[PDB]
Amino acid sequence: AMETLHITKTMKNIEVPETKTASFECEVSHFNVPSMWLKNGVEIEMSEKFKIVVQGKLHQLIIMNTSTEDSAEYTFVCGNDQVSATLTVT
Amino acid sequence: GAMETLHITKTMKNIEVPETKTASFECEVSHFNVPSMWLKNGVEIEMSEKFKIVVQGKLHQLIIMNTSTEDSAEYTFVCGNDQVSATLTVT
Ligand SMILES: [Ca+2]
Ligand SMILES: [Ca+2]
Numbered sequence: 001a002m003e004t005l006h007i008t009k010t011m012k013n014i015e016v017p018e019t020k021t022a023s024f025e026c027e028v029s030h031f032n033v034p035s036m037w038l039k040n041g042v043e044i045e046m047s048e049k050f051k052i053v054v055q056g057k058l059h060q061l062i063i064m065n066t067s068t069e070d071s072a073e074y075t076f077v078c079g080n081d082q083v084s085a086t087l088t089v090t
Numbered sequence: 091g092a093m094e095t096l097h098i099t100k101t102m103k104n105i106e107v108p109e110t111k112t113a114s115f116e117c118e119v120s121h122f123n124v125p126s127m128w129l130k131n132g133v134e135i136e137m138s139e140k141f142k143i144v145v146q147g148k149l150h151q152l153i154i155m156n157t158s159t160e161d162s163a164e165y166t167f168v169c170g171n172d173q174v175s176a177t178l179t180v181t
Contacts, residue, residue: 032137034125046123046145049147051144053142054137055143056138056139
């Protein structure tokens, strides 16, 4: 394809109190890119703890009922790009 | 066993909403980590600001923003060779 896939905006680090919801969002250059999220470099295990949202080129990860266990670096991956930010559960 | 095969476990509902209001469909599937596929009249929806696609565990949801009469259609969630359809009527 004419234009190369990349992740456009960067992602800010977030701090949330325990039990509150945390969200990460990023945007990509192309439609029809699948979401792929890592926690500390490893694919997140899908469960009712995580909501994955896509709207247009916006990809969101929603982390429910946070605990100190959720404090980590989260990464979105597509093509040859990736973007990371930290969650601190307070 | 039945769990060796991916399948729809809970259907979505027919729905009516007034113009410009938000509409949503929710179904459930048998397994975690299933991709979402949504159709509008048999054809894959085009990703845009119009549609929010949500997966939470086994729950799959399509949210249709700012409805218009052009949104009135049969929507389908596709789970491999398994499908579920329901109608949005924008009134
Ligand atoms: Ca970038
Ligand atoms: Ca079925």
